């Protein structure tokens, strides 16, 4: 019932701030579960060795201050709200081969009564691929994409892969290329600014091979 949905949103967002991290005590870390969905290779530039892919950047976390009691709102257990209204970890794609950070479209999130947020915004990413020179009767190249938070560090936000590989369940395949292999690995990265402070990334690669 929409009367109940309307009331819910107003009470969720009357005293909400999207600027502060949604933890009870500030020393806590926001846990964010991350997955990369590869949808389609849309452009392949064999001169400059660049491939453009359509991806989805799946993100999952709990916002403490967005819980409700379904009994109070006629049994509503989940709602769709605009991603612009909420705190987000500001997660970005990089080694983008023309322009630094890939622009990610702010689609609606699914918010559940437990505070659980699921968000799957679409994006277009230009990987710069390296040619594999191991054994090439048929050609191979290895394309990579880095994920990380733009501002927060590992102690404010922890990112965790939902799985070892990118999600290919919605991947439409090519007539020329095939994804031979793909993996996601997490990394702690140290920077010159900050000796005692960990940053975190997840790097997804895939090796594409030419069909005979």
């Amino acid at each position: 019932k929409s009367e109940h949905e309307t009331r819910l949103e107003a009470k969720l967002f009357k005293d909400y701030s999207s600027v502060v991290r949604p933890v009870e005590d500030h020393r806590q870390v926001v846990e964010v579960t991350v997955g990369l969905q590869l949808i389609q290779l849309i452009n392949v530039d064999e001169v400059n060795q660049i491939v453009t892919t359509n991806v989805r950047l799946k993100q999952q976390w709990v916002d403490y201050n967005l819980k409700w009691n379904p009994d109070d709102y006629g049994g509503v257990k989940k709602i769709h709200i605009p991603s612009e209204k909420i705190w987000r970890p500001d997660l970005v794609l990089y080694n983008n081969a023309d322009g630094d950070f890939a622009i990610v479209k702010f689609t609606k999130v699914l918010l559940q009564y437990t505070g659980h947020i699921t968000w799957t915004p679409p994006a277009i990413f230009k990987s710069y691929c390296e040619i594999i020179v191991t054994h090439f009767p048929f050609d191979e190249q290895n394309c990579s994409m880095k994920l990380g938070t733009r501002t927060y560090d590992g102690s404010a936000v922890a990112i965790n892969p939902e799985s070892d590989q990118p999600d290919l369940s919605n991947f439409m395949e090519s007539g020329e290329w095939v994804i031979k292999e793909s993996r996601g690995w997490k990394h702690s990265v140290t920077y010159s600014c900050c000796p005692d402070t960990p940053y975190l990334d997840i790097t997804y690669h895939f090796v594409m091979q030419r069909l005979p």
Partner: antibody
Amino acid sequence: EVQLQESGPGLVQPSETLSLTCTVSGFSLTSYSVSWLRQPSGKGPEWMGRMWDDGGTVYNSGLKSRLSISRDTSKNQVFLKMNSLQTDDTGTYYCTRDERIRAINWFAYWGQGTLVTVSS
Amino acid sequence: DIVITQSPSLLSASVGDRVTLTCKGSQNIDNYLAWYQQKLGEAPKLLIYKTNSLQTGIPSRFSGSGSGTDYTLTISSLHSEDLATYYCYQYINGYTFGTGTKLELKR
């Protein structure tokens, strides 16, 4: 200074309808929610519904078809109506003032209660 | 919804004794648990909300603790006017109440 007073008919027969009144002092109903609870005979409390600060209502889904909740802010009064009664409905009925954090609510202040007994 | 069981169901204790009541949930409650007192003929009185926040005008002897599925109310030294029935209740997933602990004083 925060007070709640429930008034009802002692006796109601089966098939008749119960109407209760909650009279409030020490605050306005426009800035606080008020819930009806009841505790039947040989049973634990249950929440029946709410008169929201903003004027609307929400009901316990199991009782929704039998109930209606209303208020007259000029009188500082909340009302409950309940029909198709049965001997199960015998118990004590409370109005509460509810307290809120973001979208979460809890019961903060009670009235003394009114005894309602359903019998031929 | 969440189901709640209270213990001890009936409790005996002399004045000045330290007593603890326990409230065990069937699922995770995540600290949205309140405790209220009910003497006979009188309006129920909230003592504690959100596991351990003391309601204003409540004496310091009353205190709360717990997490996940297991919560306690403590009365550090029992007074005679504390003779009442104590109920716990839960306010994140519907509204369910404990069966209630009756406190009888040793004498």
